[PDB]
């Protein structure tokens, strides 16, 4: 009965800021949610199993390492779910020189068995504009075409992961000065 | 082989009155479609099964027997095509306060084996005026935008559907004043 | 670890033309790649098992046929991989009267454990001009919103692909009087 929610958005959308905005709140209501970055719950399985030291190491573990890696996570986290609900940050697919990388696998959505996959938003000029003003990030010259081209992308591989699980896909926009109507939106949502 | 065939779309954009014509003009040439709905063939497995009596608390019931009574109701579609070709009316997806609901989840599709993925569309301008002059309808404030994305969606889910059964996905547009040229693309399609 | 990547486009992309070019410059740093078309492989699976003698036989074969055949035509090319980094040149979808039909369909997909799928494009207008001036073609012309319609079924059939296989989906633009542009990415990606 408690909900596994997985909440996705390219670099840059917000995705975990208005998800931990959304928790406070619902924890004022008696709702506790945990949240889990996927990426660090597959580095937690690694550390447990002794096969990485540092997460730097994780990149350079083989294809059928990463698969099991990606499986015992989605396994770790559809146990914790039992305890309470689950908020698990991921992206959808992340753009490499190789292409867009399903975040989540059909092997890691057989175990994690998600109720809900939110897709955070907003438009391409946003998104860049926001990564320019980031110092913590590195200039890269990707287009709003390209950011439109990786939210295209990972709206179908959302709704992908909905027809593979039966999970809801839901859509946010979380727009410049607008924060708070996205929070209160995923705070509806996740209730 | 007798086809089964999916026919979607949004609310408004006229995919069952267009399927309900190119049924008529199929049987003049000897060709007879039996047409169910989804939900009302769920609806009658669950009666069948003695699950569920007051229809309306169907969507409150529990995850496992709705999953159950989806791959029964599957199972009894692909039964008819025995007896005559058969048109499935169904939602590619339902967009829910929580999501875009996939209509079709995998364990369906294992079950129905369907040959073509029927998506009816228009523009979001034709689809918000149609249901904005429906008496039938409460007045939501759901804009072009909206329907465009459940479009967008919608065609996902659908070439998804297609990729996992092997079936054509089609898309027929339902113009405002030309619903005598989508009945026909259909007709081509159906026989 | 030799690779096995799919390079799709819609007709008059110049898919192939970019890959035997970038085939071409690999060669010379030693990495010798070995291309075949899907369809290719079926129609030689097809003599093997004599179902038919020549090419135009295998539209006629049955569904439970062209289902077998392509299974087996996907483990006889992952079996060339052995041998050496494999291209398969075929459809993300064939538009069809019937609709879009997924040229790698789940069971293929399964047999086939592709590594990248390349979806190669241009605009509407460029595909439109470029089939106008091929002699070998015929009219029936397809208007720009059909090419772009199929370009985005190719695209989310492309990343259903990459959901079920764990492949990366890389797209590349190949614009007229940029067919080097095109060809550079591609190298990067099949190296
Ligand atoms: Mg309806
Ligand atoms: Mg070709
Ligand atoms: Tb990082
Ligand atoms: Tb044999």
Known sequence: ????????????????????????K??????????????????????????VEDRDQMRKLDPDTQKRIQKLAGRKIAEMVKESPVVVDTHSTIKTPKGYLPGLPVWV??????????????????????????????????????????????????????????ATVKIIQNKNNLLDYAVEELISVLR
Chains 1, 2, 3 share one sequence.
Do not use: C, W
């Open 26 to 51: 619902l924890s004022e209501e008696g709702i506790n949610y945990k949240m889990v970055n996927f990426g660090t719950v597959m580095f937690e399985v690694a550390q447990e199993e002794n096969l």
């Open 1 to 24: 009965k408690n909900k596994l929610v997985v909440v996705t958005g390219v670099p840059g959308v917000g995705g975990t800021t208005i998800t931990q905005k959304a928790m406070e």
């Open 109 to 166: 959505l057989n175990e994690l068995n998600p109720d809900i996959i939110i897709v955070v938003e907003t438009s391409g000029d946003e998104i860049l504009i926001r990564r320019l003003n980031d110092e913590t990030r590195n200039r890269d010259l990707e287009t709003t075409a390209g950011i439109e081209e990786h939210q295209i992308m990972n709206r179908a591989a959302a709704m992908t992961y909905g027809v593979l699980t039966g």
